[PDB]
Ligand binder design. Structure first.
Ligand SMILES: CCN(CC)CCNC(=O)c1c(C)[nH]c(/C=C2\C(=O)Nc3ccc(F)cc32)c1C
Ligand SMILES: CCN(CC)CCNC(=O)c1c(C)[nH]c(/C=C2\C(=O)Nc3ccc(F)cc32)c1C
Lengths: 285, 282
């Protein structure tokens, strides 16, 4: 990247979102006039810039239609600015909080595009680790995009010990919870999270959203633990109930991959296109 | 690193611990080393492992195992390091029983020196415990690695935290299941749990389910653990435990500040205390 003021190339506009992790702002390229998203990562004076730089190189090497495009980065006065593709409708959580439940075909389309993104991430030896409505972006043309590629499947692989992770517990696979008492998870943890995300788009929250997050992880490690299910049987077709059953299979040895899931009836059926989301975006008035 | 068989330079002697480690001897110098072996799959990315190795090459301190080189051969990645003859403190205490207070004080002083270094290099260990603290035949103390960068997933527009063993994790690491993050002071808490582990042979609440231990750390009225038998230990050891086990990371002292504590500043802390403990194995 460059050590320069990003205002040299962009007009900084409205705050789109943020958290403790950092902020994201709308902006416009001064030359082209195209809108972009600018991730702003705040640094402390003693933070190691080289580690941030290393992460950026992953954005420079990975490219896919269903992951937000990367345009460049600016390090300036303890702020790291990352230029990404703008997605006008924000996240699916921003959309379903206004619009209400998504239709079965809208969820089918979302899942297909997210599986295309996951199949790519996984082939590049990355694991997303937090697939959920808030981390799936939608543009004005109704196209689906992941906000990042995740990070390497091998974290601390050279260490003589294992490291587990905590993403958002309601979307975490059982074997990630079990790393607190056993060893190992792999890229299939993202397939379970996609199944919870389908329930989250159908119903307006994931299963057990009112239970404490560490109790949700605890219940997943007990024997006789039953994976979650759609609460209304009649409202959804057999194909959707099966997609939920196979994506939410308890054992990762029996859970299908992103490539295998792209052959499932729910996401292989005709009539899945960006137009179904353009209909969802029309419900904002 | 090299793309060649490590057996070109090393005589492999013994399997040590399962993520596989071998004791070996250098063919030219005759010096013993530990060789870590990582099995790779045909489609694994080589650069990701070699990026990790570089971190190993950049960091150097007496209280972390020395790195000697690496070898890639037929989908096996080998990392050559300093050999620590007595193994881990857990391998030692499972035979010898409880460590003495002076032995614990010397161990903590040495680990704090390693952590102060590790933290100045912007790393976090994330799993300080007896099994991850090595001892050599001379009774010197070494961490088995330098940890990983303090920032993992920093560029992501989301919170993602990487987690060690629940019984040794700080309350703010448990709170990550609800909101926010944590910092390097989580290793100071883990060292306080390790001191109780070396004194009692188990960390606090070892019979409670690991996720239940973490759940209790997020509740209102949570109270940190203490040493069980008050009269066996001096007030300096009780105070060391009290300050390292400060619930709030904002009030918990740094490794540098903990190095001025009476327990680890007292005279007579040297490798001889550990040579005594190693005599109990024989
Ligand atoms: C439907 C609109 N919403 C109300 C319901 C408004 C709230 N949501 C919004 O403003 C919003 C918009 C319009 N874009 C983003 C985020 C990103 C974007 O565009 N490219 C990225 C690339 C990476 C990244 F990590 C985030 C983004 C948000 C949160
Ligand atoms: C006497 C042996 N004991 C039986 C009671 C314990 C068994 N354990 C043993 O033998 C043992 C010994 C003698 N060294 C190690 C490991 C390491 C070593 O030396 N340098 C490293 C550097 C990095 C690392 F990740 C591991 C090691 C073990 C497990």
């Amino acid at each position: 990247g460059s050590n320069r003021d990003p205002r040299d190339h962009y007009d900084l506009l409205q705050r789109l979102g943020g958290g403790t992790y950092g902020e994201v702002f709308k902006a416009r390229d001064k030359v082209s006039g195209d809108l972009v998203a600018l991730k702003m990562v705040k640094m402390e004076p003693d933070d190691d810039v080289s580690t941030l730089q290393k992460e950026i190189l992953i954005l420079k090497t990975c490219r896919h239609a269903n992951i937000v495009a990367y345009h460049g980065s600016y390090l300036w006065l303890q702020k790291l600015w990352i230029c990404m593709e703008f997605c006008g409708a924000g996240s699916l959580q921003d959309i379903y909080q206004v619009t209400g439940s998504l239709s079965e075909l809208q969820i089918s389309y979302v899942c297909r595009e997210v599986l295309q993104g996951l199949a790519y991430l996984h082939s590049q030896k990355k694991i997303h680790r937090d697939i959920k409505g808030a981390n799936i972006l939608i543009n004005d043309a109704g196209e689906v995009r992941l906000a990042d590629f995740g990070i390497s499947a091998q974290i601390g692989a050279t260490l003589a010990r294992r490291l587990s992770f905590i993403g958002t517990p309601y979307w975490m696979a059982p074997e990630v919870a079990a790393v607190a008492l056993k060893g190992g998870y792999n890229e299939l943890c993202d397939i379970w999270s996609l199944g919870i995300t389908a329930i989250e788009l159908a119903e307006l929250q994931p299963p057990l959203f009112d239970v404490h997050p560490l109790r949700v992880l605890f219940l997943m490690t007990k024997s006789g633990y039953q994976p979650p299910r759609l609460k209304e049987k009649g409202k959804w077709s057999a194909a959707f109930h099966n997609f939920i059953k196979v994506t939410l299979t308890k054992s990762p040895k029996k859970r299908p991959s992103a490539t295998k899931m792209l052959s499932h009836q729910l996401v292989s059926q005709p009539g899945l296109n960006r137009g179904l989301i353009l209909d969802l975006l029309d419900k904002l008035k």
